[PDB]
Amino acid sequence: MLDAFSRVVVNSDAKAAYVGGSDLQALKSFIADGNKRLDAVNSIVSNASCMVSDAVSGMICENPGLISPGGNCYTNRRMAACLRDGEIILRYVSYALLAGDASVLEDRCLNGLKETYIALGVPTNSSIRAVSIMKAQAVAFITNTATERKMSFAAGDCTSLASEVASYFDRVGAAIS
Amino acid sequence: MLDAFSRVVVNSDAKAAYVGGSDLQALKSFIADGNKRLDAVNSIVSNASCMVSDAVSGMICENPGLISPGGNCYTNRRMAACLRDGEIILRYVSYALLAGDASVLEDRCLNGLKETYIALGVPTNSSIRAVSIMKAQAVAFITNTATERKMSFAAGDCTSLASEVASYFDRVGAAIS
Amino acid sequence: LYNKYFSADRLHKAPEILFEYNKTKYDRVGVRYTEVTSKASERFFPKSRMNRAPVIEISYREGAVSTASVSLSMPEISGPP
Ligand SMILES: *C(=C)C1=C(C)[C@@H](Cc2[nH]c(/C=C3N=C(/C=C4\NC(=O)[C@H](C)[C@H]4[C@@H](*)C)C(C)=C\3CCC(=O)O)c(CCC(=O)O)c2C)NC1=O
Ligand SMILES: *[C@@H](C)[C@H]1/C(=C/C2=NC(=C\c3[nH]c(C[C@H]4NC(=O)C(C=C)=C4C)c(C)c3CCC(=O)O)/C(CCC(=O)O)=C2C)NC(=O)[C@@H]1C
Ligand SMILES: *[C@@H](C)[C@H]1/C(=C/C2=NC(=C\c3[nH]c(C[C@H]4NC(=O)C(C=C)=C4C)c(C)c3CCC(=O)O)/C(CCC(=O)O)=C2C)NC(=O)[C@@H]1C
Ligand SMILES: *[C@@H](C)[C@H]1/C(=C/C2=NC(=C\c3[nH]c(C[C@H]4NC(=O)C(C=C)=C4C)c(C)c3CCC(=O)O)/C(CCC(=O)O)=C2C)NC(=O)[C@@H]1C
Ligand SMILES: *[C@H](C)[C@H]1/C(=C/C2=NC(=C\c3[nH]c(C[C@H]4NC(=O)C(C=C)=C4C)c(C)c3CCC(=O)O)/C(CCC(=O)O)=C2C)NC(=O)[C@@H]1C
Ligand SMILES: C=CC1=C(C)[C@@H](Cc2[nH]c(/C=C3N=C(/C=C4\NC(=O)[C@H](C)[C@H]4CC)C(C)=C\3CCC(=O)O)c(CCC(=O)O)c2C)NC1=O
């Protein structure tokens, strides 16, 4: 199971991996606190489109110049590209949470991102705000403390996993600062 | 059958030509170790975009003066152009490996390239480093000894084909030195 | 000036090599001539991998752990407005 997931990322082939009950028990035996880790991942990816749109909208209401003419969210093409990058970043942070390891986020998403954004004229300070809203969102879903949506879980404490997503979102800002 | 491949390049018409069945059996009969040759070509073209980008960036990180003001990779126009040249050279080398014949690469790509570089001010020393990185990449994929990705092949020895791509890359540096 | 060797009619054009291979009867090998197109960002984001991210899909229901499944893929993505 782990080798197939690794080969999907290594190949970049866009073909989905799929797993049985004995396979899932092998990956859960490799992972730390898989039961709580898989519910934490599920809490983010069940809300990911709502998360990205709300975060990008928040970056804009705090900095309206982004959507004025010459603004880096001006025209529908740029707005859609900005929502594409918000989703990319959120997806890679989710796989770092599933893996218990920053390496995939660092190596495939964050390496070269600062230089690419500087070359494109993408505002890094505004990018950091959008990411910071996604951090607050993810901590709320993992702890089931979101104000407008509740999710269903077995009772217990998930504070370590919340501290875990915080550290991965903080790596993004640290890379692009 | 290789004359049908050459016909396309002779015409330069951008219309595709395909071989299968008896025509592909004639190609594999005509060109030495075709079965292993086609897998060797497939190993390069499956990785060609990542190869060029890593090599081109590999010449810049070792020589950061290329991306300083007045450097020959400075501004996005020059950077897109360099990355483009990388794909153009790898293209003719992958086709020279398919043919088992360096003459396409020499006649259509390397012929006049030194004088072109000198007239443009393109640094030939740094160009040789980008080519030398692609040489190492191609040898690794053909022998399936790359540390970053494994592909699937029938067991055997491919040393001759690796030593074959070696010389073809070496011809690029020999032309532009 | 480079117009001696690279004329603007033929400038930046290079062969392409194509595989229709699956270990199947109708498998083929293809070649075409083509214009090479690329952009400045590619050093870190090659066109083979660019704009891909990990979709993760999980299926569960309370106490139904015998039915549970997780899936991973990385297609190209378009953020919704
Ligand atoms: C601009 C006027 C502006 C915004 C737009 C908005 C952006 C923003 N969002 C948060 C925090 C959260 N947003 C959440 C998103 C959602 N909640 C849901 O229940 C659904 C599924 C989803 C899509 C609508 C969540 C979960 C949070 C965190 C928990 C909560 O309920 O509050 C913030 C605050 C971040 C911070 O602390 O800085 C911001 C800024 N706000 C604006 O002002
Ligand atoms: C923090 C994330 C949450 C929280 C989570 C808890 N979940 C607990 C148990 C539990 N969860 C699942 C589903 C999960 N495991 C899988 O294998 C898959 C899919 C492949 C998923 C989505 C299961 C099966 C279980 C076992 C109990 C059950 O539901 O029948 C749990 C208890 C401890 C543990 O089992 O590790 C907790 C704390 N709870 C919270 O209150 C926050 C919000
Ligand atoms: C994209 C990731 C490809 C891929 C490419 C490979 N690169 C390989 C080797 C290699 N690349 C560089 C450039 C690199 N080194 C530097 O110091 C700098 C700047 C900081 C850069 C960007 C070099 C120098 C080398 C080593 C060449 C040498 O001198 O021998 C390589 C082969 C590695 C190996 O042998 O295991 C590959 C295949 N790899 C992939 O899997 C994807 C598709
Ligand atoms: C060195 C380059 C490689 C390696 C290559 C080998 N390939 C071998 C056999 C083989 N490969 C193919 C696929 C190829 N032929 C085609 O017709 C097409 C496309 C249409 C492709 C991509 C075939 C069909 C075969 C023949 C056997 C089969 O049916 O699978 C092979 C074994 C040769 C032998 O028969 O002794 C080798 C060595 N192997 C390596 O280990 C490196 C990495
Ligand atoms: C939104 C939060 C930002 C914003 C973002 C923009 N990004 C633009 C282009 C762009 N972004 C990337 C990085 C992306 N591609 C990847 O492959 C990965 C990771 C694997 C990531 C994170 C790339 C490569 C590109 C250029 C290529 C392309 O767009 O496909 C962009 C458009 C720039 C332009 O018009 O040229 C925007 C608007 N903009 C904002 O205002 C906030 C801060
Ligand atoms: C058929 C074969 C074939 C080739 C091999 C290329 C050769 C080639 N490259 C460039 C053009 C260029 N080539 C480079 C290349 C590089 N800059 C660097 O600093 C690096 C060392 C290197 C990449 C590794 C750059 C940056 C330009 C742009 C030059 C310019 O704009 O003046 C041009 C001229 C285009 C122009 O500037 O108008 C040509 C003909 N094209 C072809 O048609």
Residue numbers in the entry:
A (entry chain C), B (entry chain B): 1 to 177
C (entry chain A): 194 to 274
The authors write:
Red algae utilise a megadalton-size light harvesting antenna called the red algal phycobilisome (PBS)—comprised of rod structures formed from stacked, hexameric protein-pigment rings emanating from a protein core that is poised above an integral membrane photosystem. Published cryo-EM maps for two red algal phycobilisomes contain clusters of unmodelled density homologous to the cryptophyte-αβ protomer. We modelled these densities, identifying a new family of scaffolding proteins related to red algal phycobilisome linker proteins that possess multiple copies of a cryptophyte-α-like domain. These domains bind to, and stabilise, a conserved hydrophobic surface on phycoerythrin β, which is the same binding site for its primary partner in the red algal phycobilisome, phycoerythrin α.
